[PDB]
Amino acid sequence: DSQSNGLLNKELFDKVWKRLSCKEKKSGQEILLNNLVQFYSKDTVEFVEKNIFQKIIEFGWEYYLQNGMFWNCYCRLIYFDTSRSYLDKRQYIVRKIWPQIDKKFAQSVLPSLTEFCESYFPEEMDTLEEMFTEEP
């Protein structure tokens, strides 16, 4: 659909990934994340979700799991994708992103994820509040 491959050229994405790998020592990680989620397509978003976000989960790095901007961006990638309908993007977010965030991190992740769920999913706000209620 006539899309120039932006940051995800294999010569530039290595320069991105060697800086995302340093994880707190280098400043400005959030802007690299936030500039890698504007693709809004099928296979482009599928590349981004298969290569950065899934791999940060797979390594289990604590800086990005701790940080609420990471999960806000990983929701905002899928939700602005114009290849899915409403039901499958909402069900994908609530069923397979939000379970993965660890409950010990919820005090930092919930203030950033709450603004997302309050802006775009006011109906599914009670599910997110009951996933992180103070009593299990």
């Binding site: 899309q3 120039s4 932006g6 940051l7 500039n35 504007q38 809004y40 939700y79 602005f80 114009t82 309908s85 409403y86 039901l87 909402r90 069900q91 609530v94 069923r95 309050e118 775009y120 006011p122 109906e123 599914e124 706000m125 009670d126 599910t127 509040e129 009951e130 209620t133």
Partner: protein
């Protein structure tokens, strides 16, 4: 505003009824009308308030005399002077008497009995009780007054051990251990009270307020919280607040939230701080809104109605504020149209289309100036807050129902309205929409128009130009850029955002009479400066020798002393 003149007018109108010696039904109702206008305007301190209750009682208006007492209790929490009078009256009453007399007594006992100066209130109820022949009821008030740290506690103890000749020490051990434990607390409390009793002196200073010791007293009753505390810190806040200070309210609410009483008590305190506090504080109010959102999960139906009446009352007083409108609309989408993932999808999609339908009929109703007060959203729309409703309609039409044709039709319709052509979330939603589709034609036409015909705040224009340059550099190639360059506007999306940042009014492409020349060295102060008409200082001296130089022509030689000032400040604001 003039609380002194409102004090003076009631002091003058009462002195007109009193010295003309008549009932004076004009001035009787005028002093009552001056009382009603004052009490609605001012919280009416109990010492001033008592005279109004005394005069109406002197005018024998029993049903109205009871109702002003309830208002007095709301106005002053430490109003034991109004509490005792309301207990002194309503004993001269009808058949409901015996039940009402204890009802006002027990309501004051939950209001004032934990105060150090509360010894008169229990004694008066004891006086009411001793006038009855319910010596069992007199005995119950005796044991309760023994257990609370009061002024004349030892005086009460010895007196109750002689008047009760029939049943004095049926349980010696229980009564004296409660009395001595009361004496342990009152010995403790004597440190703070005497530190308060030696500072309160009206000299129009911080000692009359006793705020340092009141913050000391409230602090030391917070930590040693032996469960009288929540009543005690209420009693501690009551004497400290009466001496408007919203920070004291925030500390009392923070302590009471940490103490975990039932939430309706907290809602009562929140409503009282909403009522008696002055407007524009804007910090405990949004605290109340987010408490109503957080506690919504426990009990469903009544908190929606508390929330709804709160947001309506806060668009009464801050109509220019917009976070209330989107907050109301978030709660409306959650409560009224709720549908989980587990439900079948036609139900979900019909609830979304119902929400789009009510929202569109709301804004279409308000633009064409026909109102429908049955639906609460129709009432809540204000023209400062209309734009966020249009934004919710756009974002719901585009991101949920997912039709781009209908979304573009709404953009092309509503960007021509007066109220929302200069709104920030409408245009910034438009930017996110025409960024989602990756086309640059609408984005170049948008940011080429961003200063001249779409007026946004300069912080938002700077944010849009920075993010659009960052977006264009990473999503567009040279073959698109070199065909995007047109010369009549000298527009180029790489460099034009770098020049248009801080100055909004930027046109891209007889000098001596512009308003940049005339006030050159000094802004605002305009002076036509003298200059030579045909100056030769640009001409080199290698070319001045070729032909002889003419005489100078002058312009503006009359005005080396005239300097003139457009003083907007004095004219439009000092002299109105």
């Amino acid at each position: 505003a003039l609380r002194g003149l409102d004090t003076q007018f009631l002091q003058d109108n009462t002195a007109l009824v009193q010295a003309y010696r008549g009932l004076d039904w004009s001035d009787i109702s005028s002093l009552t009308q001056m009382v009603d206008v004052i009490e609605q305007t001012v919280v009416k301190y109990g010492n001033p308030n008592d005279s109004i209750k005394l005069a109406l009682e002197t005018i024998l208006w029993q049903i109205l005399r009871k109702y002003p007492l309830l208002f007095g209790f709301w106005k002053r929490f430490a109003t034991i002077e109004y509490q005792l009078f309301g207990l002194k009256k309503s004993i001269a009453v009808l058949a409901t008497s015996v039940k009402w007399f204890p009802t006002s007594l027990e309501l004051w006992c939950d209001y004032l009995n934990v105060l150090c100066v509360n010894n008169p209130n229990e004694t008066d109820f004891i006086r009411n009780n001793f006038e009855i022949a319910k010596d069992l009821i007199g005995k119950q008030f005796l044991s309760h007054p023994f257990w609370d740290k009061f002024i004349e506690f030892e005086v009460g103890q010895k007196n109750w051990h002689n008047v009760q000749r029939i049943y004095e020490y049926i349980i010696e051990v229980p009564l004296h251990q409660y009395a001595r434990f009361f004496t342990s607390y009152k010995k403790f409390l004597n440190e703070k009270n005497l530190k308060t009793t030696r500072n309160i002196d009206i000299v129009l200073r911080k000692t009359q307020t006793t705020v340092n010791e009141i913050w000391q007293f409230e602090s030391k009753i917070k930590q040693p919280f032996f469960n009288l505390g929540q009543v005690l810190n209420d009693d501690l806040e009551n004497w400290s607040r009466y001496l408007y200070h919203e920070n004291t309210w925030m500390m009392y609410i923070k302590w009471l939230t940490k103490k975990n009483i039932s939430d309706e008590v907290v809602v009562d305190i929140y409503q009282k701080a909403n009522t008696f506090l002055p407007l524009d504080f804007k910090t405990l109010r949004y605290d109340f809104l987010r408490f109503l959102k957080r506690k919504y999960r426990s009990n469903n139906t009544l908190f929606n109605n508390i929330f709804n009446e709160t947001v309506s009352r806060y668009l009464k007083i801050w109509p220019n504020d917009i976070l209330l409108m989107t907050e109301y609309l978030c709660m409306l989408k959650r409560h009224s149209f709720k549908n989980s993932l587990d439900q079948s999808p036609k139900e979900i999609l019909e609830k979304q289309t119902s929400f789009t339908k009510i929202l569109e009929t709301s804004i279409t109703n308000y633009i064409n100036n026909q109102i429908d007060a049955k639906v609460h959203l129709q009432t809540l729309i204000n023209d400062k807050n209309l734009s966020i409703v249009v934004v919710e309609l756009i974002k719901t039409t585009w991101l949920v129902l997912k039709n781009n044709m209908q979304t573009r039709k709404y953009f092309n319709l509503y960007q021509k309205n007066i109220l929302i052509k200069n709104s920030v979330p409408f245009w910034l939603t438009y930017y996110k929409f025409e960024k989602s589709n990756v086309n640059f034609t609408k984005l170049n036409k948008f940011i080429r128009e961003l200063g001249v015909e779409i007026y946004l705040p300069t912080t938002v224009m700077n944010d849009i130009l920075t993010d659009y340059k960052t977006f264009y550099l990473t999503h567009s190639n040279i073959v698109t850029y070199e065909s995007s360059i047109i010369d009549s506007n000298t527009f180029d999306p790489i460099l034009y955002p770098e020049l248009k940042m801080s100055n909004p009014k930027y046109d891209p492409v007889d000098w001596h009479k512009k308003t940049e020349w005339k006030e050159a060295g000094h802004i605002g102060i305009t002076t036509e400066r003298p200059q030579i008409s045909n100056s030769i200082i640009e001409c080199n001296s290698g070319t001045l020798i070729q032909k002889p130089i003419s005489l100078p022509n002058f312009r503006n030689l009359e005005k080396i002393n005239q300097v003139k000032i457009n003083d907007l400040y004095t004219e439009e604001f000092l002299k109105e």
